[PDB]
Design a protein around this ligand. Sequence first.
Ligand SMILES: [Cl-]
Ligand code: NA
Ligand code: NA
Length: 337
Amino acid sequence: QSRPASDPQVVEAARKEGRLIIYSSTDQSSAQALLDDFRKLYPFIQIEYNDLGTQAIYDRFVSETAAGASSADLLWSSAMELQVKLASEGYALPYDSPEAKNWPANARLGNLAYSTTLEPAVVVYNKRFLKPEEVPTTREGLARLLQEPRMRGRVATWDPERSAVGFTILKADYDRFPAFQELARAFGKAQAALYSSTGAAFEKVISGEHYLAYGFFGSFALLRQRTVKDLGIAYLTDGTVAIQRVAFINKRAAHPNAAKLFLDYLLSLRGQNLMAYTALIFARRETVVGEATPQALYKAVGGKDKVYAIPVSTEILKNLDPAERMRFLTFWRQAVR
Ligand SMILES: [Cl-]
Ligand code: NA
Ligand code: NA
């Protein structure tokens, strides 16, 4: 009774194909439950899951296509600007997902690419050093906390010069919230350490070498919290930036119908529910019940209007413009040093 909406012509052509190749940035141990469940629905499809860095996905896909080689059927990546760039340059199979009828226009590049997640950039902290009631939930509040001598060298955030996702998140913050400028200068005052990776930042918070990290995905925070009871999460109430992992089907898929079934599964309530519940990846689909969901996120930030979803839109390509990049990085480097 929860099987994704299927075109019978598509399921029958997927049987003949009987294979699916995925290039994905989602860690395989996070995706596993979805792969196993997809196979229970479509046990006639053999999956090749390639778990790759977001740059690897873009380079590898661009290479194979250009050399004319067989590449991925489906590309699934948290690098929104690179996915949107490929899908707006002829790399994407146009396909109207029957599971995406209620997707907001800003969660889909028409029929070229789809959001699969709505993941908030949050504050994480070490509850042995900071109690929940003293962790501010606004940029101005965090800027105030970081004036305290006890916070000097105790703060982590992204290095937007070494992380594409870190860039997306901090740039969205800078473009949307004036108070971000005060907070960036406070990272300077506090001698914030910058990280190219969520895991390197989280390790230092768990160790107590930092007490607080700003701008990391709630999905990773929740996943680590399962293991680590001293990890606190605070949601920003003056405005939260959310990233959307983008999926699209290769225009040249060898198995385009298998890729439609998997894209439909990723978007369905069955797939979105399993992703939220088992992977603790914040779902896109608003009907999912549980902690890693739009409803839970909206209650935590004080309403839907306080979440800015980075859109699945060619408008985000301004982030790749050298002049725009430079203006942001010029401000950033001046403020945080
Ligand atoms: Cl990361
Ligand atoms: Na389907
Ligand atoms: Na639904």
